[PDB]
């Protein structure tokens, strides 16, 4: 599925997203717009071999297990694959243990170069939340 922004803000607030770990909701809707442009379905292979799934393009060298990513761990418990549904649970609690793994949201390199630092509030806006 792909998300509508205000959508995807309401979703990600429901699963309890604003203010985790102190990110503020703009955060994850920047860092989910760059990362997936807002598709759960999105995919993107890494020249280490792992791969990025879904609309926070979680990567299974460690946080999911999708069989082909040889020497990796899953941390998140799930298969890979169940990050791309259209709920966006699976998603959202993978991402809070990985934003609670000392890097905060440096963890998503996308973050870091195109939100941090950014008037993210702008994501949120006029949504009704
Ligand atoms: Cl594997
Ligand atoms: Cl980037
Ligand atoms: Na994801
Ligand atoms: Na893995």
Known sequence: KVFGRCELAAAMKRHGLD????????????????????????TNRNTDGSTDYGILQI???????????????NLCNIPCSALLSSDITASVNCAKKIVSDGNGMNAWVAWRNRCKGTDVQAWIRGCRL
């Open 59 to 73: 990567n299974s060298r460690w946080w999911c297990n999708d069989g082909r990513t040889p020497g990796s761990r």
């Open 19 to 42: 203010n985790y770990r102190g990110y503020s909701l703009g955060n994850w809707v920047c860092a989910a717009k760059f990362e997936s442009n807002f598709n759960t379905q999105a």
